[PDB]
Amino acid sequence: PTHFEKRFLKRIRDLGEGHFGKVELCRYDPEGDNTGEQVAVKSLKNHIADLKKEIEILRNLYHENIVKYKGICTENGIKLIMEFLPSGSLKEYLPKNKNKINLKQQLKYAVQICKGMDYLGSRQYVHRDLAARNVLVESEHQVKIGDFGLTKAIETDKEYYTVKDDRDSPVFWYAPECLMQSKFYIASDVWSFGVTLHELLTYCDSDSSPMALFLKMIGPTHGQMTVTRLVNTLKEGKRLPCPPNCPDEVYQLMRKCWEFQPSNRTSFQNLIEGFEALLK
Numbered sequence: 001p002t003h004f005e006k007r008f009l010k011r012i013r014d015l016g017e018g019h020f021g022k023v024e025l026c027r028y029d030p031e032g033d034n035t036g037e038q039v040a041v042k043s044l045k046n047h048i049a050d051l052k053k054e055i056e057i058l059r060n061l062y063h064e065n066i067v068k069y070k071g072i073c074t075e076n077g078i079k080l081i082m083e084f085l086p087s088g089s090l091k092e093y094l095p096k097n098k099n100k101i102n103l104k105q106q107l108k109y110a111v112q113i114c115k116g117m118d119y120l121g122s123r124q125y126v127h128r129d130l131a132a133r134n135v136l137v138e139s140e141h142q143v144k145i146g147d148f149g150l151t152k153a154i155e156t157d158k159e160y161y162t163v164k165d166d167r168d169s170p171v172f173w174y175a176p177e178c179l180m181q182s183k184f185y186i187a188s189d190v191w192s193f194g195v196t197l198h199e200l201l202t203y204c205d206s207d208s209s210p211m212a213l214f215l216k217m218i219g220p221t222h223g224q225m226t227v228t229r230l231v232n233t234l235k236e237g238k239r240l241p242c243p244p245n246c247p248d249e250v251y252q253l254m255r256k257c258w259e260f261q262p263s264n265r266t267s268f269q270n271l272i273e274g275f276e277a278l279l280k
């Protein structure tokens with residue numbers, strides 16, 4: 001049930017790619033009649049230790065708005081087997097469905113992301129990579145958090161996890177404590193959600209992305225100096241602007257995600273209630 005043989009994993013196309021990881025669409029067809037189910041397969045281009053930790057996290061997560069763990073494919077090597085969501089990420093889905101997805105549907109997606117994130121927090125995890133590119137579309141009515149590559153477990157009686165590695169990170173979705181001290185709280189994921197909500201409301205328009213907006217604020221910056229300028233911009237109280245046609249009530253909840261201090265930010269449960277109060 002949870003074990004998948006490499007020989008039966010029939011590669012169809014690439015779904016996503018990171019620095020050391022890749023996700024491919026496969027058809028697990030043990031009968032050899034092309035009737036088996038389509039699955040998402042996470043493999044490596046040590047990073048094995050990380051992938052094993054990611055497998056363990058996803059195996060332990062079971063929620064309507066969290067990509068379903070299916071099993072593993074062992075080669076020393078290992079592959080993570082997940083369900084395949086045919087519509088892909090919000091980053092790809094939203095620019096192609098601008099006339100289909102109205103504000104009501106975007107708020108239903110925000111509720112769904114927050115429910116998935118609240119459950120993640122209840123398990124004492126910090127995602128650290130909440131962006132539209134990691135929110136997958138099951139159908140026009142449902143989304144799921146679909147990647148856990150940077151997810152860490154907060155130790156019991158601790159409020160945050162401290163990152164100790166040399167890995168790359170989505171700095172444009174990061175809260176000040178992440179940027180300044182490499183500290184990741186549940187309140188750090190709330191900040192990233194705020195940024196993800198901004199993307200969702202702009203229909204993931206490339207010219208309106210956090211990197212594009214912040215880079216037009218900051219200017220020519222260089223990989224070394226990006227973080228210090230970003231921190232300086234945030235310290236000055238600058239934030240991503242209200243997307244076009246975003247009502248004030250929605251932008252107010254977004255601003256509650258961007259309080260400089262983690263202890264002053266809204267919770268995911270307060271966000272759920274807040275968005276549901278707006279859905280009629």
Ligand SMILES: O=C(N[C@@]12C[C@@H]1CN(c1nc(Nc3cnn(CCO)c3)ncc1F)C2)C1CC1
Nearest residue numbers: 016017018021022023040084085088089092147
């Ligand atoms: O690619 C990565 N992670 C994931 C989140 C990305 C896409 N992923 C998954 N994608 C899908 N379906 C689908 C359909 N179309 N497309 C293309 C992009 O719109 C993706 N289902 C399950 C998934 F698990 C996994 C890490 C860097 C390697």
